[PDB]
Design an enzyme around this catalytic site. Sequence first.
Site, PDB file in Angstrom:
ATOM      1  N   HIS A  81      -7.369  -5.783  -1.524  1.00 36.07           N
ATOM      2  CA  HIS A  81      -6.111  -5.106  -1.225  1.00 36.07           C
ATOM      3  C   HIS A  81      -5.005  -6.005  -0.683  1.00 36.07           C
ATOM      4  O   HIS A  81      -3.863  -5.935  -1.141  1.00 36.07           O
ATOM      5  CB  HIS A  81      -6.344  -3.935  -0.269  1.00 36.07           C
TER       6      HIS A  81
ATOM      7  N   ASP B  88      -8.919  -5.310  -5.901  1.00 36.63           N
ATOM      8  CA  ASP B  88      -8.511  -4.356  -4.870  1.00 36.63           C
ATOM      9  C   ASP B  88      -9.351  -3.079  -4.987  1.00 36.63           C
ATOM     10  O   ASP B  88      -9.347  -2.430  -6.032  1.00 36.63           O
ATOM     11  CB  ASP B  88      -7.023  -4.032  -5.081  1.00 36.63           C
TER      12      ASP B  88
ATOM     13  N   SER C  30       0.834  -1.201   0.000  1.00 38.69           N
ATOM     14  CA  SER C  30       0.000   0.000   0.000  1.00 38.69           C
ATOM     15  C   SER C  30       0.874   1.260   0.000  1.00 38.69           C
ATOM     16  O   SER C  30       1.585   1.513  -0.973  1.00 38.69           O
ATOM     17  CB  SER C  30      -0.931  -0.029   1.219  1.00 38.69           C
TER      18      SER C  30
END
Lengths: 665, 665
Positions: free
Chosen positions: B643, B611, B536
């Site tokens: 994700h 995601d 991320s």
Amino acid sequence: EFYNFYPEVGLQWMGDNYVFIEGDDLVFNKTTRFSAADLNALMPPSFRTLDAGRGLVVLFTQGGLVGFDMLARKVTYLFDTNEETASLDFSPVGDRVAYVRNHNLYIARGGKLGEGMSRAIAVTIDGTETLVYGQAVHQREFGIEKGTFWSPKGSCLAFYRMDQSMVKPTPIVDYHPLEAESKPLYYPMAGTPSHHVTVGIYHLATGKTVYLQTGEPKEKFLTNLSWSPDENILYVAEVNRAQNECKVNAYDAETGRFVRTLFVETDKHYVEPLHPLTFLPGSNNQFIWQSRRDGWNHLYLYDTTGRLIRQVTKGEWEVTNFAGFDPKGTRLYFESTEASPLERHFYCIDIKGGKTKDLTPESGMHRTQLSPDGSAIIDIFQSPTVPRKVTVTNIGKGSHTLLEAKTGYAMPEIRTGTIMAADGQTPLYYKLTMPLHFDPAKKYPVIVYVYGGPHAQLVTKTWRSSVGGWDIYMAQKGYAVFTVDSRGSANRGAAFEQVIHRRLGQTEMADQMCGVDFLKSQSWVDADRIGVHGWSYGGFMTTNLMLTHGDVFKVGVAGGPVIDWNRYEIMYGERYFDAPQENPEGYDAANLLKRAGDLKGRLMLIHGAIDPVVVWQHSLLFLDACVKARTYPDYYVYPSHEHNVMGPDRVHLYETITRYFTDHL
Amino acid sequence: EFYNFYPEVGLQWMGDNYVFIEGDDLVFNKTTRFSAADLNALMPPSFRTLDAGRGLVVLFTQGGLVGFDMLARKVTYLFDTNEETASLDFSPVGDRVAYVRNHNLYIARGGKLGEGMSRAIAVTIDGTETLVYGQAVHQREFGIEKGTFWSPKGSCLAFYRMDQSMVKPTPIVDYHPLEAESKPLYYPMAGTPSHHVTVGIYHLATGKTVYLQTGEPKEKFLTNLSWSPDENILYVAEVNRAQNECKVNAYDAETGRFVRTLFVETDKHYVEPLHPLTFLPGSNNQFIWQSRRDGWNHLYLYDTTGRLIRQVTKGEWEVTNFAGFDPKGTRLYFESTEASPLERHFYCIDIKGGKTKDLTPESGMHRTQLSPDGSAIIDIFQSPTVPRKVTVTNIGKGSHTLLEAKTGYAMPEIRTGTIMAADGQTPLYYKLTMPLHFDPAKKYPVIVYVYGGPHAQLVTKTWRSSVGGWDIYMAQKGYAVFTVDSRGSANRGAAFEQVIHRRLGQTEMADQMCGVDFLKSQSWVDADRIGVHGWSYGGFMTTNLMLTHGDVFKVGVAGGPVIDWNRYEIMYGERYFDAPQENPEGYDAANLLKRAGDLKGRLMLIHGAIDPVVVWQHSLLFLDACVKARTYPDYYVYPSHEHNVMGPDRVHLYETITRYFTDHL
């Protein structure tokens, strides 16, 4: 269609002179010239020839198209197709052009210099994403490459109407906009409902449209539309869902009514019409039909009542291109494999049949163009020892060589030969690209470059590479590259090909392993460093080989790989595999998703994200299956590319592929 | 939210007893038991506690939910939510439950044993894909985690109504069906039109609905809805698009009319309300409000006229969790970083403010639960030397230890320390996981595990790993793993964090390089084998670091990486970066697509295809940019994951990541 990238030719006919460009001038020879300035001096360069016989072409310029007569050196008409160029189909009369724009079919009439322009006519007005007009249909199978068919005298325009509202689409995503945007691709998968195609005929004189009454099943494949010379009939080769029956039917062009069935072709495995009916010169009752019915593609002479007059060509070889007839229609000219499946020669044969006469006897690959006359030919030759040799010959007379090309450094050595297929009887031809600076005393890793799918043949007597030079590039990095045309491949007759029916991958792999046995018999081959690479059907093979023979293939790279045939198209897929519901065992055996757990080597799958041939889903689901099975492939996606990576980006593709092998093999 | 996978606890309060499961029985202690059989003997196991004070829970069983009173050992009500469980929000009265099904909000009333069931009530009927009811809004920012808010006495149900028809969606593709199927995700990207949220209040007694008159701009963020104890007012913390102003407004629950603005908070960079108003026990006029206004998150005491009575907690540390008050409302209980940013202790403080009293002084991480009474606490402790130590204490009295856990083989040694940030003044804390079998006389490769985004802190005094044990796993393969909480990270005050405003990546990378300088000062570190990994914000950092310092980071693996912040969400993105139109320079500097040509090391990007946090487009466009720039990253996609890769598939993820490093670093 298998394409050889990085090809290493403006030649053509115009009237009775062969013409070619030389940057500045367009040289006509029997020897006049036409400079870009002289031409531009007539404008109110690249061009598309519309009528070789009359030397009429169309020039693509900013703000429309410019028709031009090269023999008379005059502008013919100016055409306005509102910037549409992909679907352009000019009438044989040369003063009109059909095209598709914003889902609808239009006909634009050419305008003479200073005579004013006319607004194009809209043949259709209800085109939509699920209703396609004038475009190729049936996934471009059966020789279909467009959706517009002008009648011989330009009186009518036949066209396809494809209702694909019953087809469940696949999303094709464009990742370039700020937020990605998807567009549905109406890709009909094996075993599902197919689209419904009908044929319309637009009559220019009355502005009336009638549709052929093709009836049911609505899913029937309407192929090889062929107009009668007198425009009264439109012939169609109709193929059933099973693809084991092809009926050549005649329809009334005026009313669309069914007239009669000329003849029907059937096959134990599949029938595959690929060419239209070609009428003899000056005849409205006799035509040549191409058929592989006897196990080899040959030319058949029929009369329009449906009676087979005679099979003109015969033999255990195939006609690979029908070039035409002599002026009087007493001779047929064509390219074939009679001399050898690894070669292509241009032949002549009496319409009554009999012995053929090879007009280009030199061993190698001949690509020939018959003159509008039918008196001379332009021949472009190449062989392992001959880069290229361009010749122009007055059939019967002498031959003139226009061009013929022919170091302190090295190039990969190329070896060729034959090995027996897995049946121990059928001979398979192979091509072996040796490592650069090859030392017979050393051991070398080797990569099997494979395709193996129908319609393609990778091993021929050509110059250099047949696979985009990838084999040569790999060889320059110290890796030998081996390719063998296994059973299922083309130009070897139907028996050689159809052995794969209902069992994709099985015979192909068995034959590829015979290639491996050959490689292992070579002392310079490191049997522990064997790899494999392929694209499309070759991607399927590459992957299947690593899963089936994981002890042999250590590393592989599979591009646009078919992984689950249930997810491949109806037309191509069901021909060779039959329907999923009719062949659970065959499909299951070829479903690579079911054997992802057998991947123990290094394998990189590569895919163009907007691929409309092998949908992205194929490789994505394979990685997914590998996650569940706890196996570890590698991956790379080209978001801007379709099935193949073309243009300068192909450099990136080759680097990616080769580095994977140099890293892991 | 940063999540530590592979965590290595049923404890809780019910009335005045602490309860925990022991497989078969539910043990209540001051020491009674409740076997699964005894419970099942009352049925017409896992459960969700609704009211700790009264010991009321709800059991999830086949064919509905079963409310149960653990203290009285009786079934309360049976609820039928038509199999919906994700959106369940039970009324504080305990006899009703709100939930969302097929786009609409419903309220189901519990039915007593053999008393019959009643059909749920439909609060809304026009829900659609672009009109969402009763669900979290504003991308779950500002502490929003649901869309239903019951009034204290269960008289009303407030809920969100989100019209996202003006938001251009992103396609989320499900590749499992025969033909892939896409679904639009209304992810509002930075700089684009946001969705329009309004708040409705459904009055159960009359069945009437009124919407708060929040006015314009319609894009205003409506956060931390908080009901007045007497149900007459609904308070809302409204945040502007610029996110530099937060107005706490009171609205009339009966009519929806605006009543008044209590107070307004502003900030040079951004204001971020994350918690609701919490009224003092028995009071309808005083409430605690959490605010980071003075540079540190503290508890403020306000009266409902808007007057700030007093800032209760003060100091250069932050309140990390407000647990509540004592019965009389004269004391506040909360968790904070006063003892150390690397630790968490539970404190008590007089409502008048002053000195705090640490109730869990042992150095380490304390996670505490205040009893319904406010007399005792359940404390779960862990430190580098203490796996876990469970304690139950009568505040003031003695402490009882319920549990306390504590070889011939080895485990990676973990070292910790501090280094100066790039400003040469701010101290940064780091964690260093040494190679298994570490030999100080040898050289070792090292991988920087980085996150560095706001709201997360990876270096604390906990037991074992804080990053899903990946650091330990990598270390077991001979690679040291280093992590440093660079500026921008959490629980160090606003100044420490906001230095990144309008310049994402810049200060973070500078601080990470200070970490690299530290590593290079270690004699056992092979300065030529430094790698980097993150997910991320950490994926963004991993990639940015390889492009910015390609001479240092040889290999990297970036998961769900943000590549172009213009493509990240409005709420989170614009807070730290401002809008794209207001900060071209900052966005351009962080746009990794513009520097793909700087990738000279080996980098694998990993992404879950579905995601919804970092849209797949981010990594796909990076590969695309790399194709054009002629650089070569690697890739892997998890088609079934969002994700993060969770569940058993995480084993495949770790193998993929670690093998990439062992192969290339």
